Amino acid sequence: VDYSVWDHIEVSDDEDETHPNIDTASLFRWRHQARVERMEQFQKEKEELDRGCRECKRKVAECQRKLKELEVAEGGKAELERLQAEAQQLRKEERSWEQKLEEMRKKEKSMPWNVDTLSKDGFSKSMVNTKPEKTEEDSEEVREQKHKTFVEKYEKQIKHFGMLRRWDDSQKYLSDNVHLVCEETANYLVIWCIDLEVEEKCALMEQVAHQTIVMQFILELAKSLKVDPRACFRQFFTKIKTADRQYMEGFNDELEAFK
Amino acid sequence: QETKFQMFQLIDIARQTAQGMDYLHAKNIIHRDMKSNNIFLHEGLTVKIGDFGTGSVLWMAPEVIRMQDNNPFSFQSDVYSYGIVLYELMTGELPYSHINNRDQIIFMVGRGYASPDLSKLYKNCPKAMKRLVADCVKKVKEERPLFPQILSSIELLQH
Amino acid sequence: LTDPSKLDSGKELKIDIIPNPQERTLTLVDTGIGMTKADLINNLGTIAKSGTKAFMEALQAGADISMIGQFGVGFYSAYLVAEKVVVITKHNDDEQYAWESSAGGSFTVRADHGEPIGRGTKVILHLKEDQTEYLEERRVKEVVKKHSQFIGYPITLYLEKEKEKYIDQEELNKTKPIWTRNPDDITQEEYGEFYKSLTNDWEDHLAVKHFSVEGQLEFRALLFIPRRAPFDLFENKKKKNNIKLYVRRVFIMDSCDELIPEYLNFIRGVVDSEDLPLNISREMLQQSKILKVIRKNIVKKCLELFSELAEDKENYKKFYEAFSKNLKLGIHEDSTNRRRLSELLRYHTSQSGDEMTSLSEYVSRMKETQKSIYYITGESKEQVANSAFVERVRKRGFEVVYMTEPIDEYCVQQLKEFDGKSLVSVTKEGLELPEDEEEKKKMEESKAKFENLCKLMKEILDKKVEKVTISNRLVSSPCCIVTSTYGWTANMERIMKAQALRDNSTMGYMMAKKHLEINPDHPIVETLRQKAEADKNDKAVKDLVVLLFETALLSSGFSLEDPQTHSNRIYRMIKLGLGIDEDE
Amino acid sequence: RIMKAQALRDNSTMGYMMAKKHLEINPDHPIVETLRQKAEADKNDKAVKDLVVLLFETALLSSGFSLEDPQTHSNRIYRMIKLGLGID
Ligand SMILES: Nc1ncnc2c1ncn2[C@@H]1O[C@H](COP(=O)(O)OP(=O)(O)OP(=O)(O)O)[C@@H](O)[C@H]1O
Ligand SMILES: [K+]
Ligand SMILES: [Mg+2]
């Protein structure tokens, strides 16, 4: 669990490190510019040594080649001494250059990370969704089709939706069954309850009155706000729970008054 | 606009300016561009220092106006400019302003042949402040104080 | 992969969760590697030892495995809810054993003789009586979907009623982590289904960006622009869930002002990293500056997406109408990105139709004599379009930018210029259109001709005007009120006075002084000069000048100090025209 | 006027909270009895039409409403001023 590699990070535009008497937008400019200058200044100081060391490496190598040529040859009685003094002085120089280079790399290993030195890009792909375009259909068939596609599949689920008449289980169906939030689901409760009126089934008419006024609330709300009914929320049910709550005391008569 | 402040209030502004300057130096930021038109007042006289703002010469140190070396910026350079700002706060009037010739300023400041006129300072200026102004604009960088010293002096001076 | 007979003790790789309300237990089962007797003693018996890392060390030359459990302290979190823990396990190379402890300083190991497990491990928690919450169907679903929905094996939940006597719901882990795939393999249907699953939106994303980054800091990410602004996007009472940060596909953190700026908070998405310095708790990240470096790479990419989206005129219109409020807030706050954010702006203009133009489109239509960009601010396009301030500007055929929502008064403070050209308000003192010497001569004849009328109108109105002067901007109106060059414009004052929680003690400082401009070419004004010349102290001139001033003030956008004085003047003039013979 | 002035305006939501304006007559007021008489005496009378609209624009200001376009209102004023002075 060694996390030390992460310890030294510099973020130019860091908002948590500020002072009340310095203008924030100018403080980011000075810290930004400063890290840039350091990276250029340090790179100049490094490249100066690369220039320097290459020269001494070549000078020592060539004088050593010449040393090999002269030490076996006439005048070698002095030119061995000269070209050895060159090989050795230039070799001393090489060592000095290496020390400067190794101090520079140990200084680089001591510098903090920043947004340029931590990473590089990999994948990059952008897509824009052109596909959805406007379409029309004959609603007489859509109605019958939505009855087959949903109502015949969800009429048994009427007992899964709200049965207590002042706060309800399954209220999260604004997520779980969002595609059914429509006028056809309200028409469903008027088409399908006809057997309940004929058979005087008051308790089912009373519990489904709660589901009915909720459908009328969300669809009327969506009409009234010019919004998609699917964009309603259980916060909106909580908002009609505030102050004076409900008008369903009249809908307890609708079940007879609508016959 | 030449509006006026009470001596206490002038000190409060100088104090906040120093308090900001010290924070910059602590972060190893040399402000360099220090001008009284680069310091701004806000509600409650909150001081905001920034790069947001003749003056091409006036606030710079004798070595910097000379371009005596390659951008010889240091904390003391900022101190010099600070001292100049203190001088104008403590006079209501720009330094050297019995003269205005451009080359004469480069000559007389650069070669050490005039201080700002500390005889122009407010009669209500604490002697300690008169010294602080004089100290902050001492000619040699090695002779002038750093912000920690300046600020310490200001708080002691104000109390 | 290298010994294929290893799976002959059971072929399938899966996870099962099995609550038991009747017996007050929660069981977790897997078909993974399992443990030998030596591994039960060493790995469950030793605090801060991890079998997982030892395993990872034995792998060579970059194996395609990236495991989660580095620290060797998490197993004991079982005792947060349990009174007693039993682990039953079987490796391929060993018998079946039980491990048991109640964390009382010791543990037991026993050879098991119950129903066999083919391979792997069964963890059994005997829950505390005040922790029975985790036996309930609803909390198990919430917890698994909150923390573990991207783990990459099927997680199945078993319950004794649904009709079925054991529902076995795999749907706890139904969605795949799409960002792990190569994006060239991924179609818009796949991004679409994921994004619905990430956000619970019923409609597709407008645009999506998939990207990755490499080096010391490694991550992959998905960013989505929604087709609609969320109904409550800007509410300051709601904690945002918008970006989630995962490490090795497990959920770390949320609620993040650190990962993305507040002006970009409508973007939904996922960031998933292979390696970060996590806290012991796994709830947070140790070096918090990392989040800031992740942010600086997100913002660049977000801006690029917007820019590319600006090439599709159709889709950029949908985007901009949902989120234009966002970009202008970015101009105000982001001192670094202001310059790109400005190229994303569009406005209605006077030379344009009902279609919007960019500032670079204003600049390309500029005349060679224009040195600035002209604009007007106000409460609606109709109110600024017929405005008195734009009469000579439009007469001379300059283009004028129309800015007509309250947030425009904020971003224009900070956007001083575009493409080196400055913005100039037609509402301020000291406007100029390009000069023509003939006109200059006429203005010098005019300021001489009207000089003492301006003096009288600065004697009458003295309390409440800085100067009276000839207009260089009026046509077809007798006057306008304009503000000083520093301090608030007429519109800025209206906005400020309505800020419910703002301290108004500073209004005396930030309100600008009023300037009055007269049109000298106009009938009422020239007849007012003649009458004022006829007698300077005629109270009728003092009356007429005040009635003109209030009318101008109102049409210029300033509230009247008391509207009843004003209405009463009107009701008196109405009587005079309406033929009331009773003057009383 | 507070709601129209907020920076983070959410203007999609805005249209639905505009209240309906109702106009109340003072039946004792001498302008409106003169109007009651001109309304009986000639119904096609454009003078009434102009009076009723100028009263309405003036009534908006009294009650704290802004004008939909302040220029049309000021023009009605600059016409009365020109007639009063005898300019045209
Ligand atoms: N079902 C299992 N099958 C095999 N090994 C397991 C199983 N469950 C736990 N382990 C062993 O228990 C060890 C300790 O796990 P524990 O969760 O306590 O710590 P860890 O996984 O090593 O670290 P971390 O706290 O990050 O998860 C594991 O490293 C592994 O060897
Ligand atoms: K362990
Ligand atoms: Mg573990």
Residue numbers in the entry:
A (entry chain C): 2 to 260
B (entry chain D): 436 to 488, 506 to 611
C (entry chain B): 60 to 221, 273 to 694
D (entry chain A): 604 to 691
From the article:
The Hsp90 molecular chaperone collaborates with the phosphorylated Cdc37 cochaperone for the folding and activation of its many client kinases. The cochaperone phosphatase PP5 dephosphorylates CRaf and Cdc37 in an Hsp90-dependent manner. Importantly, more than half of all human kinases depend on Hsp90 and the Hsp90 cochaperone Cdc37 for their folding and activation. Importantly, for RAF proto-oncogene serine/threonine-protein kinase (CRaf or RAF-1), a member of the Raf family, the Hsp90 cochaperone, Serine/threonine-protein phosphatase 5 (PP5) has been directly implicated in its dephosphorylation and inactivation.
Here, to further understand the molecular mechanisms by which PP5 is activated and selects its target substrates, we determine the atomic resolution cryo-EM structure of a human Hsp90:Cdc37:CRaf:PP5 complex and biochemically explore PP5-dependent dephosphorylation of both CRaf and Cdc37. Despite having a biochemically homogeneous crosslinked sample, data processing indicated a conformationally heterogeneous complex requiring significant 3D classification and refinement yielding a 3.8 Å map. In this map, Hsp90 sidechains could be readily interpreted and more detail for Cdc37 and the kinase was observed than in our previous, lower-resolution Hsp90:Cdc37:Cdk4 kinase complex structure. A complete atomic model constructed using the consensus and composite maps clearly revealed a PP5 conformation quite distinct from that found in the autoinhibited crystal structure. Instead of sitting atop the PP5 catalytic domain active site, the PP5 TPR domain was disassociated from its catalytic domain and interacted with both Hsp90CTDs. Surprisingly, the PP5 catalytic domain was not located near the readily dephosphorylated CRafpS338 but was instead located on the opposite side of the Hsp90 dimer, with the PP5 active site facing the CRaf C-lobe. Further focused classification of the CRaf:PP5 interface revealed a class with continuous density extending from the last well resolved helical residue in the CRaf C-terminus (CRaf616) to within 8 Å of the PP5 active site. The PP5 catalytic domain approaches the CRaf C-lobe, where the CRafpS621 phosphosite can be dephosphorylated by PP5.
